[PDB]
Copies of this chain bind each other. A is one copy, B any other.
Amino acid sequence: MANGYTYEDYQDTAKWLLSHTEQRPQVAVICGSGLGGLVNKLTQAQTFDYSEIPNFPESTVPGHAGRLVFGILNGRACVMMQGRFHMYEGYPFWKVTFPVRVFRLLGVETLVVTNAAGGLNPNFEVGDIMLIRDHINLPGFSGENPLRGPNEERFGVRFPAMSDAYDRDMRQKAHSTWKQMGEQRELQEGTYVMLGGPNFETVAECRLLRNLGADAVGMSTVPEVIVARHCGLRVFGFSLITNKVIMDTESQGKANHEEVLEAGKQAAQKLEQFVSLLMASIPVSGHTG
């Protein structure tokens, strides 16, 4: 595979956006986990449907609203994707990650990512929030990488590092902030593993993922962190633990799609609240001062 967007494609899109809103957000938020309520916290909210934005791919998967929203979250101006793209929809990674590069051209400096993942770590309970410390990019092992093809120097270098992808200063901020929240449960932190999807894992597969050191498993986020880190954005994200995966053959077995219970309800509301507060801690001036 190879990139199909030219540097100008991204520029035309950013210029289109800049000519349709006076808002200039410094933070971008990609909400994977059904957190519609996050958009409900936005002040001076303005929305754009993916279909009306030049060069913007369309969302298909259910629960994904499919719209870019600009607004003020806790005194901080931001832009957020209400629903993301996944390779399992048939989308190549350079399409899945198209918006991340447009964000960089809008002047955004920090990218927050969220998703819903299956807990692999035995100590995780449903509804747990997991600060992403590191990831394992399985699709990347086989060569399926959003940066495949000729490198765009105007975005970044050919061989970028990923060992420091999840901002450490912001992780310290997340922990302190969680404490202030007066939460009974502790803030988890671990390694997120990504695979293609769309089917759910088998017991054998879950065991393999865990033995490799994975703490949670999902079908997204990683490609966006790669591209964001490649073009220089500060990154940090969370995984809403919507379920504990089956590790024994004799049990409930069939991993159904009840993730919709935690999404929108239960822990999602706490995650949204958590995200709003974090906006204040985020570096750079914009949040009032």
Point out residues on A near B: beta carbons under 8 Å.
Answer: 1-2, 60-62, 87-90, 133-145, 147-151, 157-165, 191, 195-205, 207-208, 211-213, 226, 229-230, 246, 249, 253-257
Contacts and interface: CB of A to CB of B under 8 A. Distances in A.
Contacts of A163: 200-203, 246, 253-255
Contacts of A207: 213
A43 to B, nearest CB: 34
How many copies altogether?
Answer: 3
Contacts of A205: 136-137, 162
A59 B23 CA distance: 44
A143 B144 contact: yes
Contacts of A203: 134, 163
Contact of A200 (B2, B89, B160): B160
Contacts of A149: 89-90
A257 B164 CA distance: 15
A158 B196 contact: no
A144 B90 CA distance: 10
Contacts of A147: 88, 198-199
Nearest to A160: B199
A137 B200 CA distance: 11
A139 to B, nearest CB: 5
